[PDB]
Structure formats: C-alpha cells, structure tokens
Design an enzyme around this catalytic site. Structure first.
Site, PDB file in Angstrom:
ATOM      1  N   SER A 154       0.765  -1.255   0.000  1.00 58.05           N
ATOM      2  CA  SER A 154       0.000   0.000   0.000  1.00 58.05           C
ATOM      3  C   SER A 154       0.794   1.304   0.000  1.00 58.05           C
ATOM      4  CB  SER A 154      -1.003   0.049   1.168  1.00 58.05           C
ATOM      5  OG  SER A 154      -1.933  -1.026   1.133  1.00 58.05           O
ATOM      6  N   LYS A 204       2.081   6.946   5.480  1.00 53.69           N
ATOM      7  CA  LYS A 204       1.389   5.901   4.737  1.00 53.69           C
ATOM      8  C   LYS A 204       1.798   4.507   5.205  1.00 53.69           C
ATOM      9  CE  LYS A 204      -1.451   4.243   1.988  1.00 53.69           C
ATOM     10  NZ  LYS A 204      -1.611   3.310   3.147  1.00 53.69           N
ATOM     11  N   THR A 205       0.818   3.667   5.504  1.00 57.23           N
ATOM     12  CA  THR A 205       1.091   2.301   5.944  1.00 57.23           C
ATOM     13  C   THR A 205       1.123   1.349   4.754  1.00 57.23           C
ATOM     14  OG1 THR A 205      -1.266   1.882   6.214  1.00 57.23           O
ATOM     15  CG2 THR A 205      -0.041   2.615   8.165  1.00 57.23           C
ATOM     16  N   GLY A 206       1.643   0.145   4.990  1.00 54.23           N
ATOM     17  CA  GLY A 206       1.705  -0.873   3.954  1.00 54.23           C
ATOM     18  C   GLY A 206       1.871  -2.250   4.583  1.00 54.23           C
TER      19      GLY A 206
END
Ligand SMILES: *C(=O)[C@H]([C@@H](C)O)[C@H]1CC(SCCNC=N)=C(C(=O)O)N1
Ligand SMILES: *C(=O)[C@H]([C@@H](C)O)[C@H]1CC(SCCNC=N)=C(C(=O)O)N1
Lengths: 234, 237
Positions: free
Chosen positions: A47, A173-175
């Site tokens: 992501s 931003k996460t992933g």
C-alpha cells in the site's frame, strides 16, 4: 552516507521484531538507521505504492483533481487510508503499463519492475523498493522535484496528512503484504515525513510480520523512536 | 437562503456570549445560523485576514513558496507557524511589500468584506476600517476550497495546507482564529474562528465571531462552534 544507530535497536529488541527504521533530518544526506543492511534491502511496497500511484493518477488525468470522488464513496484521502483495493487497482489499470513504467522511471522508484499484472504489481508482482529509496522519493515529493505538476504533488502531500499538532504536521502511509511464511515472511511498512517548525524529518520503516497481531508495532515502534528524538513525542 | 437554527443559541446563552455561528454543508447555498441579523454584520477580521494575506503574498511573489521561512531570540517560523501565532509584524511586512494598490485589487477580486483598507497599509485589518461578515468569510473560504480565487491553484493549495489544525482518519479540519483585542465599554473587541471541515466526501464551511471584552473568554471562540459541530456529528467532541 547513512549512519547506523544501535540505540534504536532496543525498540526492536523489546518487541522481538526484525526490521529497520530510517530517519533523516533536513535531507536524505543525513540519515540514520538501526540496521544499515536492511535499510537498503528491497521489499514489495504494498500500500505504500498508493503514493506514487495517486500522483501518476492525477498527472495522467485518471484522477480529475483534489475533489475526485471514488466509488468503492471515498475521497482521495479516504481511499489512501483504507484498503480500497478496488480503487487503486482501477487507477493502475486506467493509467496502463506504458505510462506507469514511464513514471516509475522518472520517479526512480525501486527496481521499477512492474511485472506481475498492471492492477496488482505492487501487491503480488515483482516491484520492490528499499526504505532508503522510500525516503529519497518522499524527499523529492516534499521538494516538488518529482516529474509531475507542483499542483498534483501538493494535492497528494495534503492527502497524506495523518496527524496535526500546533508544532508539526505528520504525513504518512502504511503498507502490509500479508503474513506469508517463516521461509518468506510478509513485510509491513510505515513511511512519511514530519514538518516540525522549519525543520523536516523523513522516515521509512518496515518489518517482518508473520501474525497480523504484530501490525500495530509498525506504527508504535517508529513513533517511540521519533518521540524520543522530540520530533512528535506521540 | 440561510436558515436560522434557534437551538444553537443555547450554546451562546450557556456562556452568556453574544455572537454568531454560520455553518454550511457542501456549499454556501446551504447555510444555517443562530442569528440571521448578525451573520451579515461586518466585523474587523483581525488575524483571520492572514488567510487572504497569505494567498496574496504568495500570488505577488512576496512569499517565495511553501518553504518560505519567516523571522531571547525566537527561531524562525514556517508559513504554518507564522499563521498560527501572532507574528503580526511578519504579516505587516507582507502587507507593506504588497502595497496599497495591489492589496486593493486583490480584495476586490476576492470580494473581501467592505474592501476598505484605508488608514495604514500595515494595520487596516487589525485596527483599520476593513470589515467582513461571517457569511462573507464562508463565501471566501468556499472559493478557496474550490480553487476559484484569483490566484494560482498551487498557492491556494499551499495556504489550505498551512491551515490544517486537526487530523482524524475520517476528517481534516482547516481553521483560523482571530482576536481584535478587548476593546472598550462602548465597543468591545471581536473574536473569530473560521474554516472548513473535509469529512469523507462532504465539506462543511464555518464562520464564528463573538464580542469579547476579556481574554478570559477567548477559549469560547473554539469551544462553542466545536460543540455545535460535534453535536451535528461533523467533528469529534
Ligand atoms: C496495503 O499494503 C494493504 C493491502 C491493500 O494490500 C492495506 C490493508 C492493510 S491491513 C488489512 C485490513 N484491511 C481492512 N479491512 C494495510 C496495512 O498496512 O495496515 N494496508
Ligand atoms: C489576531 O487577530 C490576533 C492579534 C494579532 O490581533 C492573534 C493573537 C491571538 S490571541 C493573543 C493572546 N491572547 C491571550 N489569551 C489570536 C487568536 O485569536 O488566537 N490571533
């Protein structure tokens, strides 16, 4: 000339976590990390790829502008924060292979290998990027140096705001690729930058994860380290 | 046509405050207020003028770009830092460099209140004759939100970003406070809180002002409208 910081290793040891955290002050020339080795290792972006994808989506016109609404309805910031799997798969498809390739080359994005399927290469394809590369990319975005209009870069930067305080603004931003196996553990990310006063800090964190209950460490660990440095004290 | 919500006045009565709150959903064509008479009444913008001032400063080049830095020695301030604190001299300098003529032109394009900037190019918004109503504030913020102001989209975006004051997973609050001072017996000062909330795919514009004769009441310019919007389910309590 990224220097190592053994002190930050304590935060990983406390949780028995194998991963890396890269933190840079002012620019990508002044970085530190708890594992200089993993810092340059390339992993599926998952992501976090929503950042260059949103910029490319705007640049190519797929995303009309900042007020673009997306049917799963979600705003750009909303679509960036949730899985919104269908949304970004659709954005990627609309952009297309040729244009996507062109932009990742301009963006110097990881191994720039989009093989594996136009609407899934960042989730189960050959694309890989390192924590150091994430920071260099976010720095270009911060400076409006990516090959895209300043308008589109600004739109995405505000869409990435996750924390607001009188003294700072956190863009992040996460992933997460998924559990995987011990012979090939999944990877979880948290990347972004903090605007504190006239200063800026870029960061990139990733870790092996074999159980979704360890997912919260992806934010907690980096937050602790940045809190100690007096950057966010969250 | 603006409607009047009588229930909102209870939030003012609770604190014995005389003021007005204007809240609109989606656009300025769908507004509500606790008092139609005061919603249209023009007041000294005070620090809320930093919004058009920032846009004008960027549009005229006076402010280089989003990374522009401004100046017991206190460290420099970012655009966001400068907008949030007093830093009155910072904006006085901006006003001076923009000049009378250009300022007048921009407020005309911006349809900013009575557009009267007489009596000091560097203080007309803090003590001059410049006046703007809560409804006009909403109209102005709406234009900014839609990038319809006579300025580059880039500069409008930079200012909107610098105005972020609260971030939640579901919404982003952009706001600006204002305070003319305590005034006097016959004429108290005015306190403001204006801005907008981006919640999901919806947007809510708001403008609040109140008479104030003691700094002790300052917290109310944020708490009253926050209670009203929180009750409307727009932002967290
Ligand atoms: C991005 O890397 C992943 C996914 C789109 O591949 C998203 C989803 C998650 S966790 C799964 C929960 N989904 C909600 N129902 C994350 C994450 O990194 O926390 N990003
Ligand atoms: C803007 O209108 C005012 C001022 C420049 O006229 C600034 C300063 C303040 S509050 C100053 C200290 N008050 C103490 N209780 C504000 C504000 O309204 O937050 N903006």
């Amino acid at each position: 000339s990224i220097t190592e910081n053994t002190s930050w290793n304590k935060e990983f040891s406390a949780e028995a976590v194998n991963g890396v955290f890269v933190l840079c002050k002012s620019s990508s020339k002044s970085c530190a990390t708890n594992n200089l080795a993993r810092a340059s290792k390339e992993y599926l972006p998952a992501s976090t790829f929503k950042i260059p994808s949103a910029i490319i989506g705007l640049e190519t016109g797929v995303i009309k502008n900042e007020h673009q609404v997306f049917k799963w309805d979600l705003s750009l910031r909303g679509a960036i924060q949730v899985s919104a799997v269908p949304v970004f798969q659709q954005i990627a498809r609309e952009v297309g292979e040729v244009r996507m390739q062109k932009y990742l080359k301009k963006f110097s994005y990881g191994n720039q290998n989009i093989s594996g399927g136009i609407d899934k290469f960042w989730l189960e394809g050959q694309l890989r990027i390192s924590a150091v590369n994430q920071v260099e990319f976010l720095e270009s975005l911060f400076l409006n140096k990516l090959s895209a209009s300043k308008e589109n870069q600004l739109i995405v930067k505000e869409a990435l705001v996750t924390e607001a305080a009188p003294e700072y603004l956190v863009h992040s931003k996460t992933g997460f690729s998924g559990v995987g196996t011990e012979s090939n553990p999944g990877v979880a990310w948290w990347v972004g930058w903090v605007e504190k006063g006239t200063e800026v800090y870029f960061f990139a964190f990733n870790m092996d994860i074999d159980n979704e209950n360890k997912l919260p460490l992806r934010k907690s660990i980096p937050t602790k380290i940045m809190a100690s440095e007096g950057i966010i004290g969250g």
